[PDB]
């Protein structure tokens, strides 16, 4: 799970580089290091944001899965095995599997929410703020601001 989270964070932080790869194509032999370092720092910040958001939303997700918990209760109990089962282990196993699926769905939702928020302000920034500043500096600052806001929306400790 840690490895897949690592890879997902890196790929979602690198896909902006994927769309910025051939769109301008300025000195790749020298801009590759800049792209790598920005991707790494964005990956770290977005991973911190993902951890914070999943931790804060797990409280709601606990009761969000209650209907599915009861649905699995129905099947785990509607059997002659449940007539002479442990009568408690069933609850433990269904809680474990529902927690696992809840964590998976919550992480997916958070990752894609941050990804969707990533490509909202960057386009308008590159379209407008280039009037007075260098386009490359504008793209760099837009990416930095997007990463910072993605990190800050997690905790929100204003």
């Amino acid at each position: 799970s840690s490895a897949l989270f690592f890879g997902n964070a890196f790929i979602v932080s690198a896909i902006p580089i994927w769309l910025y790869w051939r769109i301008w194509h300025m000195d790749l032999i020298q801009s590759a290091v800049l792209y790598s370092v920005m991707t790494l720092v964005s990956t770290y910040l977005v991973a911190f944001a993902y951890k914070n958001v999943k931790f804060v939303l797990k409280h709601k997700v606990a009761q969000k899965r209650e209907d599915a918990v009861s649905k699995e209760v129905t099947r785990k109990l509607s059997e002659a095995d449940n007539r002479k089962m442990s009568r408690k282990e069933k609850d433990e196993r269904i809680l474990w599997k529902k927690n696992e699926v809840a964590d998976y769905e919550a992480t997916t939702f958070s990752i894609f929410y941050n990804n969707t928020l990533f490509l909202v302000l960057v386009i308008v920034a590159s379209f407008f703020i280039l009037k007075n500043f260098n386009p490359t500096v504008n793209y760099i600052l837009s990416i930095s601001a997007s990463s910072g806001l993605i990190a800050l929306l997690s905790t929100g400790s204003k």
């Binding site: 051939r22 769109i23 301008w24 194509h25």
Partner: protein
């Protein structure tokens, strides 16, 4: 004459275009379809296109 053209984003067909025609006739013209061949995607500027006339009546460049 293609004096004021962006060399980085647009390339001229016949190098530095310097076309002399000296003809006023419905028969034909040498070339008025300048094919600027771009190299890569980006921001392109339509700077200008130099069109001068060495009027045989006077002689100095217009």
């Amino acid at each position: 004459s293609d004096d004021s053209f962006p060399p980085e984003d647009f390339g001229i067909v016949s190098g530095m275009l310097n076309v002399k025609w000296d003809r006023i006739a419905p028969a034909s013209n040498v070339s008025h379809t300048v094919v600027l061949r771009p190299l890569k995607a980006g921001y392109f500027n339509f700077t200008s296109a130099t069109v001068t006339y060495l009027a045989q009546e006077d002689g100095p460049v217009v």
